[PDB]
Homo-oligomer: A and B are copies of this chain.
Amino acid sequence: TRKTYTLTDYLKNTYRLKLYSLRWISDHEYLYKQENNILVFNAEYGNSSVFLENSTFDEFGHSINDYSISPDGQFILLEYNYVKQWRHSYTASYDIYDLNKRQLITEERIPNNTQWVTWSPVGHKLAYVWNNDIYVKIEPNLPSYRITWTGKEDIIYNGITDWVYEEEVFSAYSALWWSPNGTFLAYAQFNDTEVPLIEYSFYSDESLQYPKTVRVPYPKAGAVNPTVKFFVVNTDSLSSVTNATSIQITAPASMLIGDHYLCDVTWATQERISLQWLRRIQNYSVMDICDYDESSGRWNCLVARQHIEMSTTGWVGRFRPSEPHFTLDGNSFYKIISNEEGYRHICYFQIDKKDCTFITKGTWEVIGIEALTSDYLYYISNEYKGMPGGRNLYKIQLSDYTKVTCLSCELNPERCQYYSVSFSKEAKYYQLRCSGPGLPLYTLHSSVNDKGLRVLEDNSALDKMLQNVQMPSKKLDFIILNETKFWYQMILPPHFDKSKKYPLLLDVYAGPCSQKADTVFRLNWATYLASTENIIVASFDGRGSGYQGDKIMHAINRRLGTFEVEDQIEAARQFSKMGFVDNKRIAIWGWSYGGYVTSMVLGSGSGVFKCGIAVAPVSRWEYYDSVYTERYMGLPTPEDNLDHYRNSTVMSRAENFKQVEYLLIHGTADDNVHFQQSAQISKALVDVGVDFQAMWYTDEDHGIASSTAHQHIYTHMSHFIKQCFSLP
């Protein structure tokens, strides 16, 4: 008997995955949300107390979306009226509650429609962006100091990013950086005056008589990009002068010669800041390190401290130049860069010496630097067992690089191979977060001796429930293509029998530096398909995929829509030759880049696939944004890479779609991959007389994450897959 994992189970979230989200507030205390109220926990012993009882804001008159405690614990920022914008941006209202007097501040309050707010790293100073201008409050109940007057809707952005910087450069909306002790406030200013606008309709609720036209500054490939400027203001002088001066720090001459980007800002000390700039042609970046000059009140970046990072085989960085991690005295820093072999490792830099020293090496890569103390550097890599899809925490002794300890590898090797970490303020404690291949496991550890303090959440409740269900299994392995290994994973149906022919669905993404083959545990649509529909769901990381060196990642440089597309087809062949795949029932599907690859694959004329589903796909690179697209494709001009731009479109393969069943889906309010992209695919298919299935989702964006739409799209896709595989 035993029920299987059904579509409803996924859509209704019957089997809930538990997690343990904590927020360190010091070197040994963290906050945890247990039953609406906020408790504070002692890391050392595990005892807690009620920090803020849930019944505190009952008669607030508003539903509170999130909170934020000032560094000194004296105040708490309350956020409500949350109105989402793009991937990271949103607007909201805020009130400050005085935790000492247990009162709600009612004077000089933060304006409504505040675009971004942030406490100073120390104390309780506040900085926020409202109407595209920056303001600063030294004290929560005192008036604000205006920092900028140039703010202008869709034109000038001070302290916040425009659309493309938020999405492709900073993975954030804020563009301001408090110095370590809060004295200085740095920030970027974006000018989109000449940036073309993407325009599309938003219908809103039925009650809106006339549709609204959403207009946003968005640079498509080869178009005019926003320009940027960087400034630094001394907040400590605000109460002493009428208008504190924003000292500007200009980009290096090597950047000013053409279009460029401000791509990283990292403070090194109270009076030292590092900036990384990137040329519009993303294979050259410069890092300036600037010191405050107490005599001229100016900021100077000595060329002797400038560092150049370039790439001859591709772009710089996985998605951008990596962040530096400075030693306390700010005289040296560690940074991940690809070595002579093409693998990303940690290099140790002296701020005024151009030659760095690699402290790690091998045919594997460092994923990120997680913490740095005067004695140790902690990082996550995929070195363990040579599995690029695994992740573990490591510790390296700064006084002896030959001393490297893996802190997570052997904790529970069968259940935990994909780790994440969170250190306390001074890295005295760290929470480990295991996400697979077994059920997620959260543990707390002491850094002084790397001893396990205790288990925070083991997901026993769910393990219990899953016992009464025929869950699918997952296989992570590899195939060798041209003396090089390529990893794939398969979500196999329960009681899998290799003596049978199962229908196969290729789950694909395959964009640059992607990884669809890993050791993470997921409860998703593929779970339902394998468990209930007895469908094998596979994923393959071929050329262009990440975390396996530049040889593989830069294979698609300037050539998107080629190798990553072909390898995916070859993967299908390879799978069919494994003998447990029904060659007559092989389907392919993907979202976003996966939608593009799926479409390109369905229109290649390979004959391997019977049907496929593309959700919010890219159809021609000239329609996607500049930062992302140009990174891999360069410029769409005849003197650069225009020919391949025009050669890698979905539309040019419309005719071959007569050989397959296709389902095209897109959200009408997708601000990322514009509906325009599918509108052009559909028109090309209509023009050559090809029938296909389509579905638009009114007012949904790139994620189609709305509760109702989410249930609707997966239901619709399920019927299509079952029909194509005629289950029925």
Contacts and interface: CB of A to CB of B under 8 A. Distances in A.
Contacts of A708: 686-689
A623 B209 contact: yes
A558 to B, nearest CB: 20
Interface stretch (A30-38, A226-234, A425-433, A710-718): A710-718
A457 interface: no
A698 interface: yes
A203 interface: yes
A206 B684 contact: yes
Interface string A673-691: 0111001101110111101
Interface stretch (A81-89, A120-128, A194-202, A357-365): A194-202
B697 A696 contact: no
A715 B220 CA distance: 35
A722 interface: no
A168 interface: no
Contact of A683 (B203, B680, B689, B693): B203
Interface residues of A, number: 49
A427 to B, nearest CB: 48
A407 interface: no
A684 B370 CA distance: 46
Per assembly, the copies of the chain total 2
B698 A682 contact: yes
A649 interface: yes
Contact of A201 (B201, B206, B695): B201
A60 interface: no
Interface string A180-223: 00000000000000001111110100100111010000001111
A679 B683 contact: no
Contact of A210 (B201, B220, B711, B712): B220
Interface in A593-635: 620, 622-623
Residue picked from A206, A222, A674, most chain B C-beta under 10 Å: A206
A466 interface: no
A693 B694 CA distance: 8
A699 B676 CA distance: 11
Contacts of A711: 689
A668 interface: yes
Given A209-B623, A211-B199, A676-B201, A716 B691 contact: yes
A709 interface: yes
Contacts of A577: none
A687 B699 CA distance: 12
A136 interface: no
A651 interface: yes
Contacts of A683: 203, 206, 698-699
A689 B211 CA distance: 24
Interface of A: 196-201, 203, 206, 209-211, 213, 220-223, 620, 622-623, 649, 651, 668, 674-676, 679-680, 682-684, 686-689, 691, 693-699, 708-709, 711-712, 715-716, 719
Q: Which 5 A-B pairs have the closest CB atoms?
A: A683-B698, A679-B698, A686-B712, A199-B213, A203-B679
